[PDB]
Every structure is written in structure tokens, then in C-alpha cells.
Amino acid sequence: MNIFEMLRIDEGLRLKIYKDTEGYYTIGIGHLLTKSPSLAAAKAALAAAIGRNTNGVITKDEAEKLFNQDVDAAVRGILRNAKLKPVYDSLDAVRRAALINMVFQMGETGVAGFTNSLRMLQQKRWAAAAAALAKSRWYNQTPNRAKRVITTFRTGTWDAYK
Numbered sequence: 522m523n524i525f526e527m528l529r530i531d532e533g534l535r536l537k538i539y540k541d542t543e544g545y546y547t548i549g550i551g552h553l554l555t556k557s558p559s560l561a562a563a564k565a566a567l568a569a570a571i572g573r574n575t576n577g578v579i580t581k582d583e584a585e586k587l588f589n590q591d592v593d594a595a596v597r598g599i600l601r602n603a604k605l606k607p608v609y610d611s612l613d614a615v616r617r618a619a620l621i622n623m624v625f626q627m628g629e630t631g632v633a634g635f636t637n638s639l640r641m642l643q644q645k646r647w648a649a650a651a652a653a654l655a656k657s658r659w660y661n662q663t664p665n666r667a668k669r670v671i672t673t674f675r676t677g678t679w680d681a682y683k
């Protein structure tokens with residue numbers, strides 16, 4: 522198991538524009554297109570990202586090319602961020618995967634705001650961290666995915682995903 526396989530299970534693969542759990546326009550493997558409620562805006566944002574007039578639809582290869590870009594961006598965002606970096610540095614390889622999963626899903630800024638949790642992770646206080654993460658809006662909005670990620674931090678194994 523690796524970060525790529527982990528995210529393909531959590532995000533799935535959609536070839537047509539859709540609305541996420543927060544109602545935003547998304548496509549491919551969890552690729553946020555826009556936060557604007559306009560479907561034309563989303564379509565526009567899509568053509569720019571693909572470099573082709575698509576009419577709201579993409580090929581599997583396009584989705585994969587967007588996935589590679591977003592995982593790279595997630596990893597680079599972590600490493601660049603003063604709050605995120607030290608946390609990543611401190612962790613084993615499995616738990617590092619969990620943190621990249623969160624960043625991919627809620628952006629650098631979003632995760633950088635989980636102050637209490639990140640400090641507990643850095644102190645290796647597994648149970649306290651899992652319990653704190655369980656009270657977030659994040660958790661309440663997408664509970665099955667969040668529990669998988671949470672269990673990944675709690676345990677340091679890939680069990681939630683076999």
C-alpha cells in the first residue's frame with residue numbers, strides 16, 4: 522500500500538464534473554475545480570486545467586495527470602510550511618502518508634489550522650490526537666474516510682485500508 526493507492530480508495534475516480542460533500546465542483550481523483558457555485562465557472566476552470574475545451578468530461582489519463590500534480594503539490598506544501606514540516610519530520614513512514622492525505626483533502630492552510638492535533642502528533646500522543654481529530658467538522662462531514670485516516674495515525678499500520 523502507498524499514498525497513491527490510499528488516495529484512489531478515499532477519493533474514487535469520476536470522469537464528469539460533480540459536487541463534493543461541501544457542494545464544490547470537483548472532477549477526477551478528488552480534484553477541486555472551483556468554489557464558485559457557477560457550473561460555467563467550473564467548466565471554465567476545467568478547460569484551463571486540461572488545456573482543452575472539454576464540455577465537462579475527462580479521460581482516465583487526464584484524471585491521472587491531475588492526480589500526480591496534486592500529490593506533488595501536497596508533499597511540497599507540507600515541506601514548505603513552518604507548521605506542517607516539523608510534524609512530518611517527526612513521523613514514521615505510514616503516518617506521514619496520513620498527513621499527506623489530509624493536505625490533499627483540505628489544503629495546506631486547512632490542516633495547518635489543526636493546532637491542538639498536530640502538537641499531539643508531534644508528541645506522539647496517539648490516542649489524544651485521534652480523539653481531538655474526531656471532533657472536527659472534517660470528521661463529521663466525511664466520517665468513513667476520516668476514521669480510516671484517524672486509525673492510520675492511531676496505529677501506524679495500513680489496516681484500515683487491507
Ligand SMILES: [Cl-]
Pocket residue numbers: 635636637638639653654
Ligand atoms: Cl485539533
Ligand SMILES: [Cl-]
Pocket residue numbers: 662663664665666667
Ligand atoms: Cl465518508
